[PDB]
Structure 1
Amino acid sequence: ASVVVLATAPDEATAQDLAAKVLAEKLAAAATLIPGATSLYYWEGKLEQEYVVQMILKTTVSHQQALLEALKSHHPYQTPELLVLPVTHGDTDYLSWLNASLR
């Protein structure tokens, strides 16, 4: 089964580095980067807003744990946003390519 992983990085340099690392290690098949986003959350009763690059990574269930572990390790921040969403269907050729890319 395939999955989508949502992760954020603090800047473009970091997003590139993260993607390059996990792609080289064959922990993900592909990564989409979307710069120019904003993340909002509370920290110690204050509304914080930070620039982020949204990442959308594609991998398989077999690799999801290892991918999260690698992203967490290489990410500069302590507790980065790392979430896995299930893929229930898709283009047969794409999903095969995704799986083959991690062999």
Structure 2
Amino acid sequence: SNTASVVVLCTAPDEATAQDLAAKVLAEKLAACATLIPGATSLYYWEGKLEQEYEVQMILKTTVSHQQALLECLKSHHPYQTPELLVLPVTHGDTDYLSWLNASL
């Protein structure tokens, strides 16, 4: 059987950072795959001020058994103090793809 999987959402200030973060967690085998979507814009209040920054949206694939380690790793290498680090559950997926995801870890 395959271990339950998840997708992790994280945002980086730019493409270089996003790729460095992705390369690192992939090497550490904490994620099986990482999708980087550049050209994004994030709006949020930071200490009372409305900010609007350019960001690269990251979507990382891994399993529940690695999510904790993945977030800890991402947070350490991330330039931001409190980066976006959210985990969404994958309730279902193609069996063979999930096997590859599991095998990659």
Same amino acid, percent of matched pairs: 96
CA distance in 1, matches of 2:67, 2:47: 31
Q: Which runs of 5 or more residues in structure 2 are unaligned?
A: none
SS in 2 for 1:79: coil
Q: 2:30 aligns with which of 27, 31, 36?
A: 27
TM-score by length of 1: 0.97
CA distance in 1, matches of 2:59, 2:103: 19
CA distance in 1, matches of 2:28, 2:47: 37
Q: 1:42 aligns with which of 45, 48, 70?
A: 45
CA distance in 2, matches of 1:45, 1:73: 26
Query: 1:65 matched to which residue of 2?
Result: 68
Give how far 1:56 is off. 0.3
CA distance in 2, matches of 1:2, 1:44: 35
* Residues paired across the two proteins, number: 102
Deviation track 1:29-56 (CA, whole Å, cap 9, x = no partner) reads: 0000000001110022221000000000
Deviation track 1:49-84 (CA, whole Å, cap 9, x = no partner) reads: 000000000000000000000000000110000000
Query: 2:85 matched to which residue of 1?
Result: 82
SS in 2 for 1:56: strand
CA distance in 2, matches of 1:66, 1:45: 32
Query: 1:11 matched to which residue of 2?
Result: 14
